[PDB]
Enzyme design. Structure first.
Site, PDB file in Angstrom:
ATOM      1  N   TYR A 116      67.391  10.137  52.901  1.00  0.00           N
ATOM      2  CA  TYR A 116      66.382  11.174  53.081  1.00  0.00           C
ATOM      3  C   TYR A 116      66.114  11.380  54.552  1.00  0.00           C
ATOM      4  O   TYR A 116      65.748  10.438  55.254  1.00  0.00           O
ATOM      5  CB  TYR A 116      65.072  10.769  52.407  1.00  0.00           C
ATOM      6  CG  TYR A 116      63.911  11.717  52.662  1.00  0.00           C
ATOM      7  CD1 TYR A 116      63.373  11.882  53.947  1.00  0.00           C
ATOM      8  CD2 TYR A 116      63.355  12.466  51.616  1.00  0.00           C
ATOM      9  CE1 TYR A 116      62.323  12.767  54.185  1.00  0.00           C
ATOM     10  CE2 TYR A 116      62.298  13.354  51.843  1.00  0.00           C
ATOM     11  CZ  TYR A 116      61.794  13.499  53.126  1.00  0.00           C
ATOM     12  OH  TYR A 116      60.781  14.392  53.350  1.00  0.00           O
ATOM     13  N   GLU A 204      63.633  19.901  54.991  1.00  0.00           N
ATOM     14  CA  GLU A 204      63.851  18.668  54.243  1.00  0.00           C
ATOM     15  C   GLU A 204      65.210  18.612  53.577  1.00  0.00           C
ATOM     16  O   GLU A 204      65.555  19.486  52.784  1.00  0.00           O
ATOM     17  CB  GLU A 204      62.768  18.503  53.182  1.00  0.00           C
ATOM     18  CG  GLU A 204      62.739  17.147  52.506  1.00  0.00           C
ATOM     19  CD  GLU A 204      61.676  17.081  51.426  1.00  0.00           C
ATOM     20  OE1 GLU A 204      61.833  17.782  50.398  1.00  0.00           O
ATOM     21  OE2 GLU A 204      60.680  16.341  51.604  1.00  0.00           O
TER      22      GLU A 204
END
Ligand SMILES: Nc1nc2c(ncn2[C@@H]2O[C@H](COP(=O)(O)OP(=O)(O)O)[C@@H](O)[C@H]2O)c(=O)[nH]1
Ligand SMILES: [K+]
Lengths: 393, 305
Positions: A116, A204
């Site tokens: 991530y 993101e």
């Protein structure tokens, strides 16, 4: 503002970011043909909605999951037919989620490691921040909770920009070993710069991965754009279709009205943001069911008022309206007129409750008192609150 | 450094103020009224009209001049979004003790850059952007709030919403309590003054006996504040603090009229804000309508009435 995935992907691509090859299509057959043109080991079908968790949602057509892997293009089309037109309900959408009108058909890749990575203006370092975790594929909130040390942040000085020092160091932290390590670095520098270019409040990527072939790839992306930046991101905002918006709101924005439809019966329009939130609040506290939240932005104008009254009523779920306005700049009088002047031209048939206060109080109470209209007058926000509720029992 | 500039948040009758974007629709409108309230508006600015006059006042070319020629210790900005950013740095360069940006719509990134410039200096203290401004009932009014509803008094108010402040101001005058200083910090995620910059002032201002904090969903300004209160407002001589956070019912991921009012990625919710502030002994009103009576009771419970 948020763009669809295929829009975000092209943008990231146009700015040197490794995304997966893909084609967009709005029919089951285009999807099929699209799977063919790709021509690869495995294909990836992804419904295009602004929400997240699509790959764990459920379509109204019965189909479960928004992301589907398949090596057979004919399956791509069969699955597509279950996405095109139906409603996807992910753990982030309403109850009936959102309706899908477009799907992405892209080339799948194998994922060795999932990580991530994200960039955002952090409201703590009052500056851009890098947020990485060597544990990807999972919702970030979770990983955080479950294992905090697994999270890595790096404040980037908005004037110096990102530094190798930071990039590489993050790359290391993400798990990218030796050779690959520097690829992830370059990519991270790419995101930061793209991030700044497009005035994004956040970019993101999840997973920000590694393939068996040794390629660093942004397999998925979610970019939130700073609305205050529309004036200098004209091309990026053109792509914002405004299709996933609640039917209503679109209308309001046409008169520059901050509308936000909830799931209730007691509509209500207030001026000023906080009072707007405050009114929903005080309504819910008294067993109410706020039907929305509306903000007459800065100042008002009989136009807005009426317009605001038209959108709110066109909605058949409303059983009352709670007007709560604080006469500051624009006295209460000009507001009262717009109200009464609208009740008449709109022949509304919903019990209306009005709460005014501030500049011109007393006068505006007569403008209403006089009109002879069924306008219920409240003494404060508590008053307006409780009364507005009974009016729907 | 920048914390040294908190001092400038307390405008008063002595505060001489200039307007940037003076001859604009807004500058002009809020200036005619800034006068009618009694604010010492000594002039304004606009490129290419230095020497001229507007509203019977002088119009300089640079904030630099305007200050050195009027001795203005403050400046207000109404300029459109694409130029509010520049307008602030310009005040910062001219070292104007106080800068209040009203303008809503400045790209966040711009504000981050301003905050960068800003934090590495102590000459200028910024309020905003996207705020109502600041007011010292009776002595000074910088901003767009309805001055008449205010009445010099004891309650110190700091808030992220304008309308919600007015509500508060109205409530503390009905109860005959009055306000010492009201600072509207803004609705944006990145501004030059937070809750603590003001709580810091209130706590050390003898004129302020009580404090009303008004927040809402988004960020953690309310949290840092609750922390601060625990550290600095605990004790015997602690001043009462009443608050109300807005948005206890807002749907996630949605921007609520305020670029900064949004719960995102789990952060921003109102309940934490209320749980935190309460831990710091802040008395929280569950109704925005009870701000006035609540704090009235607090002063009551301490024979401060
Ligand atoms: N093997 C493989 N899996 C993929 C690929 N693209 C996406 N996925 C998986 O599809 C899942 C759901 O899609 P996702 O990224 O979560 O979009 P979201 O459900 O809306 O958040 C993810 O957890 C990925 O691991 C791919 O190219 N190859
Ligand atoms: K994802």
């Amino acid at each position: 503002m948020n763009l669809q995935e295929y829009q975000s992907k092209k943008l990231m691509s146009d700015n040197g970011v490794k995304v997966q090859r893909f084609f967009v299509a709005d029919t089951a057959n285009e999807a099929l043909e699209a799977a063919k043109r790709l021509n690869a080991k495995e294909i990836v079908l992804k419904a295009q909605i602004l929400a997240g968790g699509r790959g764990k949602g459920v379509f109204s057509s019965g189909l479960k999951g928004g992301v589907h892997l398949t090596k057979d293009p004919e399956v791509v089309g069969q699955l597509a037919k279950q996405m095109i037109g139906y409603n996807l309900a992910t753990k982030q959408t309403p109850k009936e989620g959102v309706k899908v009108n477009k799907v992405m058909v892209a080339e799948a890749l194998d994922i060795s490691r999932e990580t991530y990575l994200a960039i955002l203006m952090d409201r703590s370092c009052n500056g851009p921040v890098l947020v990485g975790s060597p544990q990807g594929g999972v919702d970030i909130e979770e990983v955080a909770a479950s294992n905090p040390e697994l999270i890595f942040k790096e404040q980037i000085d908005i004037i110096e920009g990102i530094k190798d020092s930071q990039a590489q160091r993050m790359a290391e932290n993400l798990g990218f070993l030796g050779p690959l390590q520097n690829q992830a670095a370059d990519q991270i520098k790419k995101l930061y710069n793209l991030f700044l270019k497009i005035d994004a409040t956040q970019v993101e990527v999840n997973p920000f991965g590694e393939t068996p072939e040794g390629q660093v790839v942004c397999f998925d992306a979610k970019i939130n754009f700073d609305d205050n930046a529309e004036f200098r991101q004209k091309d990026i905002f053109a792509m914002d279709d405004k299709s996933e918006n609640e039917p209503i709101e679109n209308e309001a924005a046409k008169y520059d009205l901050k509308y936000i439809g909830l799931d209730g019966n007691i509509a209500c329009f207030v001026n000023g943001a906080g009072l707007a939130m405050a009114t929903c609040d005080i309504i819910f506290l008294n067993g109410g069911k706020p039907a929305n939240f509306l903000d007459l932005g800065g100042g008002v104008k009989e136009s807005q008022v009426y317009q605001a009254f038209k959108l709110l009523t066109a909605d058949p779920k409303v059983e009352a309206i709670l007007v709560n306005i604080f006469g500051g700049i624009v006295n209460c009088a000009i507001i009262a007129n717009g109200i009464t002047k609208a009740c008449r031209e709109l022949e509304l048939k919903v019990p209306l409750v009005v709460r005014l206060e501030g500049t011109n109080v007393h006068e505006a109470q007569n403008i209403l008192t006089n009109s002879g209209l069924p306008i219920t007058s409240a003494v404060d926000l508590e008053d307006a609150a409780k009364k507005a509720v009974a009016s729907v029992t | 450094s920048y914390t040294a500039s908190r001092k400038h948040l307390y405008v008063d009758k002595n505060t001489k103020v200039i307007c940037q974007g003076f001859t604009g629709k807004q500058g002009t409108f809020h200036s005619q009224q800034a006068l009618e309230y009694g604010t010492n508006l000594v002039g304004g600015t606009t490129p290419g009209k230095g020497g001229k006059t507007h509203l019977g006042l002088p119009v300089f070319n640079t904030v630099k001049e305007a200050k050195e020629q009027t001795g203005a210790t403050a400046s207000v900005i109404y300029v459109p979004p694409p130029f509010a950013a520049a307008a602030i740095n310009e005040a910062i360069d001219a070292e104007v003790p106080l800068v209040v940006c009203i303008t809503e719509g400045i790209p966040q990134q711009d504000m981050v850059r301003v905050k960068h410039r800003l934090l590495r200096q102590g000459k200028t203290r910024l309020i905003g952007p996207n705020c109502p401004g600041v007011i010292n009932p009776g002595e000074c009014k910088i901003g767009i709030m309805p001055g008449h509803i205010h009445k010099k008094g004891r309650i110190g108010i700091v808030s992220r919403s304008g309308t919600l402040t007015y509500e508060a101001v109205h409530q503390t005058t009905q109860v005959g309590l009055g306000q010492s200083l009201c600072v509207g910090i803004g609705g944006d995620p990145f501004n030059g003054t937070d809750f603590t910059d003001c709580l810091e002032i209130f706590l050390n201002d003898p004129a302020t006996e009580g404090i009303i904090l008004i927040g809402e969903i988004g960020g953690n300004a309310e949290e840092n504040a609750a922390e601060f209160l625990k550290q600095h407002n605990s004790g015997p001589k602690s001043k009462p603090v009443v608050s109300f956070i807005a948005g206890l019912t807002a749907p996630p991921g949605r921007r609520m009229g305020h670029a900064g009012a949004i719960i995102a990625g789990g952060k921003g919710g109102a309940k934490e804000k209320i749980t935190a502030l309460q831990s710091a002994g802040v008395v929280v009103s569950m109704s925005p309508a009870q701000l006035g009576t609540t704090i009235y009771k607090e002063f009551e419970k301490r024979k401060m009435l």
